[PDB]
Design a protein around this ligand. Sequence first.
Ligand SMILES: *[C@@H]1O[C@H](CO)[C@@H](O[C@@H]2O[C@H](CO)[C@@H](O)[C@H](O)[C@H]2NC(C)=O)[C@H](O)[C@H]1NC(C)=O
Ligand SMILES: *[C@@H]1O[C@H](CO)[C@@H](O[C@@H]2O[C@H](CO)[C@@H](O)[C@H](O)[C@H]2NC(C)=O)[C@H](O)[C@H]1NC(C)=O
Ligand SMILES: *[C@@H]1O[C@H](CO)[C@@H](O[C@@H]2O[C@H](CO)[C@@H](O)[C@H](O)[C@H]2NC(C)=O)[C@H](O)[C@H]1NC(C)=O
Ligand SMILES: *[C@@H]1O[C@H](CO)[C@@H](O[C@@H]2O[C@H](CO)[C@@H](O)[C@H](O)[C@H]2NC(C)=O)[C@H](O)[C@H]1NC(C)=O
Ligand SMILES: *[C@@H]1O[C@H](CO)[C@@H](O[C@@H]2O[C@H](CO)[C@@H](O)[C@H](O)[C@H]2NC(C)=O)[C@H](O)[C@H]1NC(C)=O
Ligand SMILES: *[C@@H]1O[C@H](CO)[C@@H](O)[C@H](O)[C@H]1NC(C)=O
Ligand SMILES: *[C@@H]1O[C@H](CO)[C@@H](O)[C@H](O)[C@H]1NC(C)=O
Ligand SMILES: *[C@@H]1O[C@H](CO)[C@@H](O)[C@H](O)[C@H]1NC(C)=O
Ligand SMILES: *[C@@H]1O[C@H](CO)[C@@H](O)[C@H](O)[C@H]1NC(C)=O
Ligand SMILES: *[C@@H]1O[C@H](CO)[C@@H](O)[C@H](O)[C@H]1NC(C)=O
Ligand SMILES: *[C@@H]1O[C@H](CO)[C@@H](O)[C@H](O)[C@H]1NC(C)=O
Ligand SMILES: *[C@@H]1O[C@H](CO)[C@@H](O)[C@H](O)[C@H]1NC(C)=O
Lengths: 37, 184, 49, 135, 408, 146, 49, 98
Amino acid sequence: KQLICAQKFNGLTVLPPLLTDEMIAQYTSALLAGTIT
Amino acid sequence: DCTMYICGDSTECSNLLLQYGSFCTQLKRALTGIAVEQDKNTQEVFAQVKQIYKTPPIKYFGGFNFSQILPDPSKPSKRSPIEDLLFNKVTLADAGFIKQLICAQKFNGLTVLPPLLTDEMIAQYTSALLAGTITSGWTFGAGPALQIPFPMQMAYRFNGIGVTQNVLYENQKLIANQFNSAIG
Amino acid sequence: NFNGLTGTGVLTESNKKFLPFQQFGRDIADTTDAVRDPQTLEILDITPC
Amino acid sequence: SFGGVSVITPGTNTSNQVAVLYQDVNCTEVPVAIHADQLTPTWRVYSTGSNVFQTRAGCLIGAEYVNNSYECDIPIGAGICASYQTQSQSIIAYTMSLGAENSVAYSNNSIAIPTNFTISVTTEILPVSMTKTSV
Amino acid sequence: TQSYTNSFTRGVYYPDKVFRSSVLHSTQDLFLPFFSNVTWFHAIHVSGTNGTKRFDNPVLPFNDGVYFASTEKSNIIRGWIFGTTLDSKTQSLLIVNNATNVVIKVCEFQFCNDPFLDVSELRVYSSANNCTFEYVSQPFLMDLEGKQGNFKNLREFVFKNIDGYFKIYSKHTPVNLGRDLPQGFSALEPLVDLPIGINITRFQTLLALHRSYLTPGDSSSSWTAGAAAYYVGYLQPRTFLLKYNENGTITDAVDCALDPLSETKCTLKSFTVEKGIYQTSNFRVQPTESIVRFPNITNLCPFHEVFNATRFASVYAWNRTRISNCVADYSVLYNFAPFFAFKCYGVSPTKLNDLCFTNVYADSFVIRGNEVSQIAPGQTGNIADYNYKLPDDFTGCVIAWNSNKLDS
Amino acid sequence: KIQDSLSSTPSALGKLQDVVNHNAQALNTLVKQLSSKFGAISSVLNDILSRLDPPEAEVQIDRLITGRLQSLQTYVTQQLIRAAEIRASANLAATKMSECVLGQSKRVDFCGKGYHLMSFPQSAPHGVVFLHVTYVPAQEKNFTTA
Amino acid sequence: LSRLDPPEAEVQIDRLITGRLQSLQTYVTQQLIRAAEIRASANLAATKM
Amino acid sequence: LSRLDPPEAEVQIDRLITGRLQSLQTYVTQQLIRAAEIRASANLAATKMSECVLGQSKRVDFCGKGYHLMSFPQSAPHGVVFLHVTYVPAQEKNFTTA
Ligand SMILES: *[C@@H]1O[C@H](CO)[C@@H](O[C@@H]2O[C@H](CO)[C@@H](O)[C@H](O)[C@H]2NC(C)=O)[C@H](O)[C@H]1NC(C)=O
Ligand SMILES: *[C@@H]1O[C@H](CO)[C@@H](O[C@@H]2O[C@H](CO)[C@@H](O)[C@H](O)[C@H]2NC(C)=O)[C@H](O)[C@H]1NC(C)=O
Ligand SMILES: *[C@@H]1O[C@H](CO)[C@@H](O[C@@H]2O[C@H](CO)[C@@H](O)[C@H](O)[C@H]2NC(C)=O)[C@H](O)[C@H]1NC(C)=O
Ligand SMILES: *[C@@H]1O[C@H](CO)[C@@H](O[C@@H]2O[C@H](CO)[C@@H](O)[C@H](O)[C@H]2NC(C)=O)[C@H](O)[C@H]1NC(C)=O
Ligand SMILES: *[C@@H]1O[C@H](CO)[C@@H](O[C@@H]2O[C@H](CO)[C@@H](O)[C@H](O)[C@H]2NC(C)=O)[C@H](O)[C@H]1NC(C)=O
Ligand SMILES: *[C@@H]1O[C@H](CO)[C@@H](O)[C@H](O)[C@H]1NC(C)=O
Ligand SMILES: *[C@@H]1O[C@H](CO)[C@@H](O)[C@H](O)[C@H]1NC(C)=O
Ligand SMILES: *[C@@H]1O[C@H](CO)[C@@H](O)[C@H](O)[C@H]1NC(C)=O
Ligand SMILES: *[C@@H]1O[C@H](CO)[C@@H](O)[C@H](O)[C@H]1NC(C)=O
Ligand SMILES: *[C@@H]1O[C@H](CO)[C@@H](O)[C@H](O)[C@H]1NC(C)=O
Ligand SMILES: *[C@@H]1O[C@H](CO)[C@@H](O)[C@H](O)[C@H]1NC(C)=O
Ligand SMILES: *[C@@H]1O[C@H](CO)[C@@H](O)[C@H](O)[C@H]1NC(C)=O
């Protein structure tokens, strides 16, 4: 995104989590399938 | 209190502190979080029960004697003899009781906020869940407390660890005497 | 170095609506975000590198 | 006779009325005594003569005691929590209601056993990660 | 006439020149208390012709600036007056506007009334004696007419003299329809700045007495009602938390010293506070007076004897003198020596006359110029380690002056 | 009805809301810490260099840098504690996932209140929410036992 | 503040206040860790109950 | 202390000692958090010993993966290492049930 978050041109960066919230949902769905089948 | 602890009633020192940025509002927030976390700790540990139980007026548990752990009306704090033993053993320093010498000398913004659950309702929680665990067993940990007699609850606990009810119902007096001696 | 206010970054034509007197923009950082050119009297944007 | 000052208020969009709590001080001495350029908080417009209750955490200004006890909303200390109550809206400070008082029918032969159950779903919200950052 | 009114929420300006948007920045500066007492004033000169004399001009205090708000048709009010002690004993200010002009003077003006004869000059001062500063240029107020008197113009002026740079924070709000100080909120922006330097504690203003109207007469006082159409407010130093709009203006603001709810909104940077308890500040009982208990001594211990001597001993054998019970004034000694160097240590000589000492010791000698600075706690050399050393924890200070005229 | 409870409740995801807002507030305080004089003439480096000269500019910058470094230090110091508490909560969540979800739990009042049947986890922003399915004995009737 | 003059009393006060602030920060940093330990013990106590 | 003189060496030493003290304070602040983490892990290890080693655990996925049988601990440098023994159903076959 290069106003509050954009203002951080002060060496303060937030790193994206390794597991984006589309594979975490896959994990949850998979173990739901396990726990209900 | 940052201002009181650092610059005691000095306008110039307070002015010099103000420029330091929001380095004490954060300090206040940290300790406020600590205090509310303490209150939540006590509430979570003790207030596991939605409703307060009272022991039945009569006290017979098939030879089991809970006199040392159930609160007594004789003592003015409504506590168990054991609980009073612990209260005597532990030497509390401060409790925030509007004292108005070590605690007194803290005219430096260091105050001790009294806990939300005073030690007369914590005793009520403890007594309530004691009544629950000695009249209803575990059932009050799941739903409405289910009135179950204590020798039978005891035989059920024995069933829990693979000893079967017959051991308990053939040794009830022995288990009661051992339990009473241990509690004493 | 607009009117003695320094800083390093890219300047874009901003959509801010600085009032006739307000000169340097701000965000909630106590750091400048937009500036008005003292000569052209137009509202620039400040975005560091 | 200094001490902490705490403001007890409901949500701003519920009222603009608050009840001040002074930390660890009896009111009969200082917080009732007030004059212009005498106490550092100049918000002292509060009466200090009405709705003055005494609490072990220091006495409270702005709310009146109620014998009734409910699940407490704004914690105060020493088993006291004030909350907004419809009389017709004012702040009331009471003693904590520990919970619904209940009895059991323990006997040496009576038992209680359910005949119908109830499946209920609860929620436990556990954080597992916080916003990773680098400086 | 004079009457009182409630300030409501008004008298808020932008503390700075800088722009903000969707910020809740707070500041400490001079402001108007919200819901404060405001004094109306009116001057009746309509019957002045039929004798009876105006007789209606108080001496309004100025302490810590003044807020101004009123509604004049075109130029009914012209200017204001600052100063103190009135007479030529001290100075005074003569701020007044002219059509499209303004003239400022700090001359020592002696006067008795405030009648700026016009609808000219004079009648309001009689001494252009020792004027120090003057100023001109565009006037503060621009008149705008909505073709009718319904749009009653309101001229909100913030007046301050903090280290000069006298402030013209002002705005035009003709949205009034008759109600005095209508509910709402507007901000104020500056126009000009200029330093003078003067102790002002008196305020007065100038009206158009030569043609006045709508000045009813009554005995209204002590929190009563009366039409004056001229408001004055005083400022006190406060902390304010301001809501800067998305556009950049000020939409609304709250005080930090009026109500505990406002104090909460100020101590946590938000206009909205939810249910719960919060910590704001403490409360301290203020001192009633200050008590001094310095020992009851009057015999001034001899400092002239040690300072102004004729046989000052050598450095290798320094001349030590003990000071005993005495009240010593460390301000009469400045004429006892040229005082080439009067540097002092952790005790500063300035408020040295408000301290009490166990016992004071003075040692006098003579040294060379290149070693006048050699005497200090922990110095090393010839004298500094062989003839006289000061310990590192030494408190007090040294006095040096050249004696080349005498010791030659 | 659990979806309706979550939707119409004032705030049920208080823990995740606090987890996000705590980092947001810490970051904003850290950034706002840049504008403080820390006992220096000004808090802007270009000005404190151009107006001043290196002799005392060095010590002024030293004061500003030690203040700034201490302010940054407190941020990470509280960050380690927050992440340790989050590690404890995540270990608690992991055991809950390993048990309540992948089997029944004989631990009473661990996987929700009441006797436990199973659970269904659902992904959440910066956290996980469990849907414990629990057996509650509900209404009862007294009997006479021996 | 009764002995010095403001010019250097400012730096003396600043040195004292930064020392005091460091001392106070140490206390709260220790308190946070003690609270983490107490919270772990209290969660263990809640599970035990 | 061989170069300067006490007057200014006092402030120079003061700056050096406050820097060194800040550095040392950082070390023990990190040590406290590290030891808190190790204490939590050691409580986990103690519960793991008392549960897995001294009996079967009905807790799923606590003492290794699969149904738990027992555990043999092994001493490790500044740590403990468990040998969980687990029953995994391995190969299976479908069937018809009612
Ligand atoms: C308004 O009144 C002032 C005095 O109250 C007058 O100032 C004169 O301004 C003109 C402008 O060129 C000068 O030539 C005169 O010398 C000024 N007179 C004095 C006595 O200073 C004038 O009547 C008005 N001011 C203006 C027009 O600037
Ligand atoms: C104010 O102006 C008056 C004008 O007369 C000054 O009065 C005299 O000024 C001369 C200047 O050479 C002095 O020698 C006299 O002693 C003054 N007479 C007095 C003071 O009675 C007066 O000095 C001026 N004051 C200032 C402060 O400028
Ligand atoms: C401005 O001048 C007036 C002149 O009266 C000062 O008022 C006097 O101040 C002294 C010093 O404190 C005191 O004797 C009284 O407060 C006043 N004297 C009389 C006779 O009333 C006023 O203090 C001056 N302002 C400032 C800021 O010094
Ligand atoms: C030291 O004390 C003597 C008094 O013994 C004073 O001498 C005066 O010096 C001034 C200036 O030269 C003369 O105007 C006086 O007439 C002198 N008076 C006397 C009585 O001598 C003075 O206080 C000091 N003198 C020196 C030279 O420092
Ligand atoms: C040291 O003290 C003073 C300072 O020069 C010298 O002078 C006498 O000091 C005594 C007090 O000790 C006074 O009572 C005398 O009045 C001072 N003057 C004379 C002429 O005696 C004193 O002589 C010095 N002592 C030394 C150098 O041993
Ligand atoms: C203040 O009042 C409380 C409540 O009555 C009382 O317990 C306390 O002792 C009083 N303060 C002192 C110092 O006695
Ligand atoms: C500034 O000056 C230039 C030329 O000197 C002129 O063209 C322009 O109109 C002036 N004003 C603005 C706002 O640029
Ligand atoms: C506050 O409450 C009022 C009425 O109770 C409501 O209209 C308003 O939307 C609420 N505001 C917020 C921010 O919740
Ligand atoms: C509370 O209880 C006592 C007596 O029962 C007394 O203070 C008062 O009458 C009661 N107050 C109310 C509101 O019932
Ligand atoms: C229950 O205990 C009481 C008190 O000892 C006794 O009188 C009663 O007979 C007992 N009932 C049974 C069924 O044992
Ligand atoms: C204003 O002053 C009058 C009389 O001086 C007084 O009666 C009234 O209470 C005051 N109001 C405020 C808000 O100060
Ligand atoms: C605020 O800005 C917007 C867009 O720049 C504009 O439409 C609106 O009129 C402005 N509000 C004012 C000037 O009050």
